[PDB]
């Protein structure tokens, strides 16, 4: 199973369409699940990637006016349960009800989140880790200058490869992160 990781493209709103480069590599017919972070912008991001998969889920950032998607979520991708939020939440750890509620977010084999528009990918106590950062590479609060990115999951069995992939000067830069869960 391939899984395409991304989001805050903020089309057309920052930037009017994600780089050709990596446009190019996404292709219908390959992709069997689409976990999009949220800050896409107008329907006609969603419209896209739902031709490029049969299984899309999307969260709700902040500035999304489409309330039908939920603000967090728990997605079953073989055998891994992976959770999917925006991450623009202002909640203190000190609501010791709300507290209650994360558990199950935290309590997944991947954790997606995205709104700072910086990508991470790593692995801790056997649980994997994703932001995907900015597909368009659109500015965030302090910074200019974000290296657009995007992230691809081949899950097999109890293996996932993480491709990410950057648009770094002239070229798309991929690293491969290997994750095998005891
Ligand atoms: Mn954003
Ligand atoms: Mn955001």
Known sequence: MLVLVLGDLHIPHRCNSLPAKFKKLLVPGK?????????????????????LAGDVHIVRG???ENLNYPEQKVVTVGQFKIGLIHGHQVIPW???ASLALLQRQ???????????????????????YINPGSATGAYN??????????????????TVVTYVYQLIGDDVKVERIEYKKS
Do not use: R, W
């Open 62 to 64: 902040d500035f999304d």
């Open 31 to 51: 992709i069997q699940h689409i976990l999009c972070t949220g800050n896409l912008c107008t329907k006609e991001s969603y419209d896209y990637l739902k031709t």
């Open 141 to 158: 609060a302090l910074e200019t200058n974000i290296i657009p990115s995007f992230v691809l999951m081949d899950i097999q069995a109890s």
């Open 106 to 128: 935290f309590d997944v084999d991947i954790l997606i989140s995205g709104h700072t528009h910086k990508f991470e990918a790593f692995e801790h106590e056997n649980k994997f």
């Open 94 to 96: 000190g609501d010791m």
